[PDB]
């Protein structure tokens, strides 16, 4: 009763090679499941994290290189445009010959970079307003500095778009870095040195004189301004409640409540909104509804922005854009980022040009590249198998509801209604393959020059920003996919109450119609469970069946949810990560993902037990003396065989909403009585604590 097919041998070999059978499963299941992978692998110089999951993404890039690198006579225009974009990206000799010239030509259109400009005040100061400077970077280039103004889905009215106002992102990974001491010192030093190195290159190319102490002074001031901005931003812990974050107001109300004084000029919110909205010919009045996500930040900004000049502000705003463009210029510019990249990621070199380029074209032409990907790598017939697995997991979730003692009957019924209403999206939208003309029309406005990579990326920025802004007066497209197909991930959209499983994730170790079902349920079954559970986590549960931010919970049901979920906050908050210098995980910021992981594991294992009931035991895998209940957990854990560079661990512990792979494995299995029974774990062994956190 042993499976001896080619497919079973490959599954068995992989499972055998990754594990360390000398480790006791109940002492450390991560080391038992992944110890062999850990002993055999070294993190590549270009990777900040490496493991089975990242390897899948590296392998998908290989497919993208194969389908983009060679022209074919049959190629439709949309495909021709993707391949021409790819060719401009990989031509490093044309890029190197242009030096920094494409940036120099762009600099006047953003009101220049004072430090790299002679007589800046004379040249731009006359026509400089914060309203115009912030809006220019936003509307034309998608660069959001000081004030993040965007068009997006209305949380309380999923069918429409609204303008949002939020705090902007920082140059460094999180606000924590701006402390600039201990584990953050190297990154702060590399960041300012990076500003200076770029200012020095620009000044050298423009043939301007260079005073080293003045470069140091000016860029240290950019850092002091940004440290004040960072300290004014709300921590992620204070942005986890979508009810508290949502503050709908009119432009009139914003002008009263959140006034600002910049360079001795009173900030006009109406002027700023119109400076952006005019780009796609939309006029705005004080009657326009605006969602303010950061009212506290706008309040703290008022005393900060009065202390700095037009010069100091433009030095930061322009740097925040330049930072991102330096990698698209000649080797000299690319080199200037080396220490900064090493401090944030630990990587000693940049990823292969073709990989960055395949990823860049995938990101900007997700439908054209998605089409090329699915034709080369995806079954399509497998879409139906995943459709069934989704139905089995959705059913289990609905069944689990009645077995929840902490939720009342009314909240159980409403949760069932939302669970029933979840729309699924599997593999790819059929249209990208079957409707060549719709695909050609999507990229109509794009015209790439094969020798002008920088101009192509600039065109992409304007196109992306114009497309998002013109959505304001439009209804949200129901058919629209929230992700391209050539993606190794899955998603949940709270606004559409939809789960998305791109072709990229529908492959081993997650899914194969040719691998054991114990592996399918432990892999993609668990991923399906994770995405459904996102509709019911600390964020998703605040959204209804139609995707609206509305409370469908009774006070006692909500209170009991918070109590059950507080266990996971403490459980994961107590994990200490050696690679991150002994720092604790943020149990609050990782809560949504930990609820989803714990919820998903339960639903997939129960759906797999239901499968064994209906179809009986599966044939055993050779060379593995484990049953299929054990193989389910083994596959589940092997998704996360991998490790992190310590620089990247410091980064991700602050920026990632997911717990690191090892803790997702340890954490979920510690809470699983089902795991402990499969591996016969003694009570209070590391993998089997007495207290187990449960929510779904
Ligand atoms: C680590 O786990 C402990 C135990 O669950 C957590 O301790 C609780 O902390 C809160 C807030 O300080 C107290 O009100 C509780 O009384 C504590 N409970 C116990 C049993 O001591 C602790 O918060 C967790 N640490 C992190 C960083 O999450
Ligand atoms: C958008 C994101 C998608 C999610 C898909 C997923 C969900 C759970 C598991 C998994 C399997 C076995 C054990 C535990 C968990 C694997 C994949 N991706 C990540 O979680 C990491 C991606 C990354 O690192 O970029 C989300 O929904 O959070
Ligand atoms: C790179 O661009 C230069 C200048 O246009 C051109 O001479 C060269 O052929 C290009 N290389 C490739 C491989 O396309
Ligand atoms: C950070 O912000 C708070 C609140 O606005 C302020 O009181 C404090 O002085 C700031 N700290 C630093 C280091 O800038
Ligand atoms: C914004 O204000 C400036 C003067 O402060 C003005 O020249 C410009 O036309 C205004 N833009 C819009 C769209 O109102
Ligand atoms: Zn998730």
Residue numbers in the entry: 54 to 749
Structure paper excerpt:
Neprilysin, also called neutral endopeptidase, enkephalinase, or atriopeptidase, is a zinc dependent type II integral membrane peptidase belonging to the M13 family. It degrades a variety of vasoactive peptides such as atrial natriuretic peptide, brain natriuretic peptide, bradykinin, adrenomedullin and endothelin-15. The extracellular domain of NEP is comprised of two largely α-helical subdomains, with domain 1 predominantly containing C-terminal residues while domain 2 is formed mainly from the N-terminal half of the protein. The two domains are arranged to harbor a large cavity in the center that contains the catalytic machinery which is formed by residues from domain 1.
NEP in complex with LBQ657 crystallized in the orthorhombic space group P212121 with two copies in the asymmetric unit diffracting to 2.0 Å resolution. LBQ657 is bound to the active site of NEP by an intricate network of interactions that involves all functional groups of the compound giving rise to the high inhibitory potency of 5 nM12. In the crystal structure, the catalytic zinc atom of NEP is ligated by the side chains of residues His583 (2.0 Å), His587 (1.9 Å) and Glu646 (2.0 Å) with the fourth coordination provided by the carboxylate oxygen adjacent to the P1 methyl of the compound (2.0 Å). The methyl group of LBQ657 is pointing towards the shallow S1 pocket making hydrophobic interactions with Phe544. The backbone amide of LBQ657 forms H-bonding interactions with the side chains of Asn542 and Arg717. It places the carboxylic acid in an ideal position for optimal interaction with Arg102 and Arg110, unique for LBQ657. The P1’ biphenyl of LBQ657 binds deeply in the S1’ subsite of NEP, inducing conformational changes for optimal hydrophobic interactions. When comparing our co-crystal structure to one with a compound harboring a benzyl in P1’8, an analogous induced fit of Trp693 towards the S2’ subsite is observed, which in turn leads to a conformational change of Phe106. In NEP the space occupied by the new orientation of Trp693 is available because the adjacent Gly714 does not project a sidechain towards this area. The residues corresponding to Gly714 are Ser735 (ECE-1)13 and Leu744 (NEP2) and their side chains will impose steric constraints to the conformational change of Trp714 (ECE-1) and Trp723 (NEP2), respectively.
